[PDB]
Amino acid sequence: SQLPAPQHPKIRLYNAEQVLSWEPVALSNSTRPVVYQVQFKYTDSKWFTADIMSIGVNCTQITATECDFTAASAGFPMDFNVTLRLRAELGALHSAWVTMPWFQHYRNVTVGPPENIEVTPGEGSLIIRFSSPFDIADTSTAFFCYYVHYWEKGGIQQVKGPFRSNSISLDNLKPSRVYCLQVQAQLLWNKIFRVGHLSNISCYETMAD
Ligand SMILES: *[C@@H]1O[C@H](CO)[C@@H](O)[C@H](O)[C@H]1NC(C)=O
Ligand SMILES: *[C@@H]1O[C@H](CO)[C@@H](O)[C@H](O)[C@H]1NC(C)=O
Numbered sequence: 001s002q003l004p005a006p007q008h009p010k011i012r013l014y015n016a017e018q019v020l021s022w023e024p025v026a027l028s029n030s031t032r033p034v035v036y037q038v039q040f041k042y043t044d045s046k047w048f049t050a051d052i053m054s055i056g057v058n059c060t061q062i063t064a065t066e067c068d069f070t071a072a073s074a075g076f077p078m079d080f081n082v083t084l085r086l087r088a089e090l091g092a093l094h095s096a097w098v099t100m101p102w103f104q105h106y107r108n109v110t111v112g113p114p115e116n117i118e119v120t121p122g123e124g125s126l127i128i129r130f131s132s133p134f135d136i137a138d139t140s141t142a143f144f145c146y147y148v149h150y151w152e153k154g155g156i157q158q159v160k161g162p163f164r165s166n167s168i169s170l171d172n173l174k175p176s177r178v179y180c181l182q183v184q185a186q187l188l189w190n191k192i193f194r195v196g197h198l199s200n201i202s203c204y205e206t207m208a209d
């Protein structure tokens with residue numbers, strides 16, 4: 001015998017976040033809570049159970065309707081090919097497995113804006129500093145390139161980049177003028193690029209002297 005399977009499962013891959021979510025399976029009002037089990041496979045490996053010792057988080061017999069793989073070190077290596085599966089359970093009864101499309105985090109990720117954008121005005125310059133959208137420890141596998149879009153109000157937009165640094169100088173600017181700008185990252189991976197979201201517009205006046 002068989003329970004109904006969870007509907008509309010989704011995988012969120014945003015910056016460093018990895019979260020599987022799904023809609024609850026509700027049986028009769030009188031039934032005790034349904035629980036869920038998540039498993040994962042690396043290409044053609046065994047089906048691993050998503051538990052603290054296999055991936056860093058406990059998504060076995062949970063009542064919650066999500067498995068956040070990076071909530072605690074935890075999570076899938078970003079170049080690993082991963083297939084997730086999910087089911088509902090009530091004791092020894094369970095649903096069929098719902099199997100997700102495979103992903104690789106670098107292939108499938110949505111890249112957010114650089115954060116902590118800090119601008120130090122100079123006489124004819126603005127120095128722009130910011131944090132990467134997320135940390136990539138192995139620099140030889142993947143890296144970010146950055147672009148700054150900037151303009152005077154009502155002017156035509158200019159673009160500087162790409163550059164690898166987390167600091168960039170906009171030079172040869174007019175003194176005592178307001179420049180508005182947005183920073184954007186592009187992720188490069190040697191198997192692919194992802195274009196990141198633009199930061200919010202912020203505006204700075206260059207120094208007089
Ligand atoms: C990822 O692995 C799946 C099988 O689990 C395979 O069908 C797919 O082609 C693989 N993707 C890549 C990019 O190797
Ligand atoms: C995993 O989390 C659930 C939710 O509290 C808990 O009941 C279950 O026994 C946990 N299993 C382990 C091995 O920690």
Ligand SMILES: *[C@@H]1O[C@H](CO)[C@@H](O)[C@H](O)[C@H]1NC(C)=O
Pocket residue numbers: 011101102103104107108
């Ligand atoms: C990841 O990207 C590839 C497109 O290159 C696609 O085949 C695959 O279905 C995507 N996976 C997910 C889970 O979005």
